[PDB]
Each structure stands twice: as structure tokens, then as C-alpha cells.
Amino acid sequence: RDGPVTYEAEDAILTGTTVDTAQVGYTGRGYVTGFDEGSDKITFQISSATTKLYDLSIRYAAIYGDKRTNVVLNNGAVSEVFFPAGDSFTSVAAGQVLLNAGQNTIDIVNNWGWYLIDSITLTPSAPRPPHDINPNLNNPNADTNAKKLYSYLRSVYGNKIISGQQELHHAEWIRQQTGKTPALVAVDLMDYSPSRVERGTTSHAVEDAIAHHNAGGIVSVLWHWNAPVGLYDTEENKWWSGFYTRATDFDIAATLANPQGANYTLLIRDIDAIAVQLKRLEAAGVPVLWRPLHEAEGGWFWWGAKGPEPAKQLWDILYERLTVHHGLDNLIWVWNSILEDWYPGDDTVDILSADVYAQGNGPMSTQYNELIALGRDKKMIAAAEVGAAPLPGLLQAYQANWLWFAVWGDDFINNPSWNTVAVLNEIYNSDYVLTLDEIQGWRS
Ligand SMILES: *[C@@H]1O[C@H](CO)[C@@H](O[C@@H]2O[C@H](CO)[C@@H](O)[C@H](O)[C@H]2NC(C)=O)[C@H](O)[C@H]1NC(C)=O
Ligand SMILES: [Ca+2]
Ligand SMILES: [Hg+2]
Predict the structure, then answer these.
(1) Atom 21 of ligand 1 has which residue's CA nearest to it?
(2) Which of 157, 375, 380, 397 is buried most deeply by CB count within 10 Å?
């Protein structure tokens, strides 16, 4: 079945090369030689049922001293493999290879040349161990629907990916193009920030969340926290950009070092103003995937401008004020920084997340594995913000077991350069991608 498969060099497409039997230790009929000109190669024709990730090994004889080789997957970029000795036939690890459902090619092209190739062995990459996900939320007093949401997420983890979108009107536009609706909708508490309210900002974020909760959906809430003070309010740096380090002189380290000041008083004014909106959601029975202090490690937001320690301390202020003081039990705490120095701690983080903005609709494998290492597989990993919706074929192949994905709004989801309607349909109509339809009755 799904195991090591050797492909003998003799039984392949030879371009300016020949089959030989002089050297000792080969497998099969013989081996391939005649690596003079640059155009000389071995084109192996391999096929797969689905799109999988295989490990590559080359069986070579470097009798003309140590040489270098070019490996080509489906007429793509070269990959130099070094052959160190050699007196006999031995094997080298040539990294990983992603094969697409159907016909594929693995060429061994003359680089330095003057070597003998016996065979190539493709082994399907190691299946990931079952995730050791924590069964319960950090808050012991967690309400019914938060406890339900966490269990449902825990049950689907590694099996499927929950589709998600930033803003309800964008979730409706997806239904207009794919006939499917994101299971998860993310809303921003941004226009609830007193600093912004003071300048006339209104928000329907609580209205949109409850609407989607009534449609049987999952709700994610982030907060673009506009600093209470320090607003430059310049033509270049307007008050409405007040969440940016660039737009405020607001020093969180100073503010936390002086807890009896006015700066710290206004900070709690802001947390309590937002707590009014969350309590309003709690009373409405809406479980929330609460994601405050997002992209902290980046430092482009005032809450991560003074480095990791003030950021972590603020996370714990929010956790004490919202969980203990305001007594909010509908919140599932989602951390949004990859770095260990920035990680607050396992006792205040329920689910780990990342914001990845790279074109191509890839599995964002590297970021997923970084968080696997961070939460040591005890916490679920989510793609809290993506620019490009991930393809389920690649998510599965690279075993990038993201719990959910949430494509950002304007200039991303509706931007053909990031997401085409074609790719959207492909993703939204997959048996791997859970839509609104498919998640119905999760609260039962
Ligand atoms: C309260 O916060 C404000 C905003 O960060 C602080 O005011 C700024 O202070 C710096 C010096 O530390 C000045 O360069 C700015 O011009 C001030 N801005 C304004 C609009 O006044 C204020 O100092 C903080 N209070 C404390 C005790 O640190
Ligand atoms: Ca052979
Ligand atoms: Hg609106």
C-alpha cells in the first residue's frame, strides 16, 4: 500500500544517457551513465491518486569523485544534491517532493555529471501523530455555549477546516459567488473604542455577531484598540489610525509601570467600554473566539511597541478584568503571536493563531509547525487572518491542520489577485472545508 516505492533508473526516459552493468551493488537490471553534456538527464514518470508529499532518496555511485546533481520536479526549479564519495552504491536524502494527482516527473539532470544512478525511492511523508488537545478551557466557570464551541472545535481538529470571513457583508458576497457561506464570521470591536466614539464612531459589530450566531454560525472577535491618549491627529497620522504605533505616542510600558496614573485609568476605561459589548454578546448566548492584542510581536500596534513583556502584562490585565472582574464566561482566548518571548502562558491562552498574508492559496505550513512547537501540540492552531484562502488539497498534503481560516475583507477576499472566484468555489465546495450548512446543529 502507501509505502516505499523504488523506481529503477534503467526503467526510465534516458536523454543522451545509456544503461550499464559494470559497477557492483546496483538494484534491478543495472544503472544509468553517460553524464557528459548539460542536457543529459533521467526523466522518471511517477503518478499519484491524490496530491501527496513524498520523501526523496537517490541511489548513486560517485566513482569519478564527489559531484553535484540537479533534481527537477514537474519541470520546476532545480535542487542541487551533493554526492560525497564514492567507491560503492549508496543513498542520499534529496528532501521532500509534492506530487499532484495524476502524472508527474522527477528529472535527474547533469550538473557536474560523471556519476552512476541506480534508482530513486519515494516514500509517503510521515503521518502526523494524533493531536494532544487539552479537553477543557482555562476558565473553569466557562458558560455552556463556550464549553460547547470548544468541544465542537476539538472534535473537528485535524479532520476538517472551518471556513471563515472578516465581516458579515463579505460572508454574504461569498454565498453569492460559491452558493456557500463561511461557518465563522469575525467582527472588530474597533469603533467601540472610547478614543474613536469621542470622534463620532458607531459600530454594529454586536448586531452582526448575534445575526451570524442566530444563523447557526461561529463568532470570532478581534479589537483594533485605538489608544486612549497620545493621538498625533496629523494629516499623515489621523486619529482613526490610532491603533498604530506610528499614530500615537502612547507608551504601554510607562503606563503599566505607573498603575495609579491617568494613562492606566483610561486604559481600564477602554477595557470596560469593550466589556459592555462582550457582556451584551454573553447575555445573547454567543460564544466568542476572543482575539485581543493581535499581531503584537510585529510592533506596528501600540500594544507591542514596547516589546514582549509589556504586551504579555496587558494580556493578563485583560484576562483579569474581563474574566474575573466583569465575570465573562463566553470568551475563548485566542493568542496571535508566533514568538516564545511574546507567548503569555498556557493558563490564559486556549487556542493559538497567526495572521498570514502570502499570495498563492498555500497551506502556510511553516507558520502552522511553528505554533505546533509553541503550544507543544496541547493547543489548537488557527489561521486567524489570511490574505489568500488555503487550498484543501495542500492543507492535507502538508498536514497543515489549521482549525479555521478567516480571509480578510476589502482588497483580499474580493481581490482576484489574492482569491479568484474559481479558487473560492474550489475551496468552499470541498468536503474538507466546513461551511455554515455543514456545521448546523453543533450547539445541539
Ligand atoms: C499620559 O499619556 C500621554 C500620551 O502618551 C502622555 O503625554 C505625552 O507625554 C510625552 C512625554 O512623556 C510628550 O512628549 C507628549 O507631547 C505628551 N502628549 C500629550 C498629548 O500630552 C502623558 O505623559 C502620560 N502621562 C504619564 C504620567 O506618563
Ligand atoms: Ca538500477
Ligand atoms: Hg456599516
Answers:
(1) 230
(2) 380
Cell of 433: 472545508
Q: Which of 67, 99, 127 is the last residue of a domain?
A: 127
Kindly give, in sequence order, each residue whose CB lies less than 8 Å from that of residue 420, ignoring residues fewer than 6 positions away. Answer: none
Residue 290 and residue 334 in one domain? yes
Residue 37 annotated as part of some ligand binding site: no
* 269: containing domain: 128-444
Q: Which residue, among 243, 240, 203, 238, has the nearest Cα to 225 in the 3D structure?
A: 243
| Residue 67: CATH number of its domain | 2.60.120.260
Whether the CB-CB separation of 338 and 374 falls below 8 Å is answered with yes
Ligand 1 pocket: which of 229, 233, 234, 303 to mutate (most atoms within 8 A of CB): 229
Active site residues: 295, 385
Does 207 appear as a known binding residue? no
* Resolution limit, Å: 2.8
Residues 271 and 191 in one domain: yes
User: Of 127, 143, 169, which one is at a domain's C-terminal end?
Assistant: 127
* Experimentally determined by: X-ray
Which one-letter DSSP state was computed for residue 251? -
Given ligand 1 and candidates 263, 268, 269, which is best to mutate, with the most ligand atoms within 8 Å of its CB? Answer: 263
| Residue nearest atom 11 of ligand 1, based on CA coordinates | 249
Contact (CB, 8 A) for 278 and 322: yes
**How many domains are contained in the chain?**
2
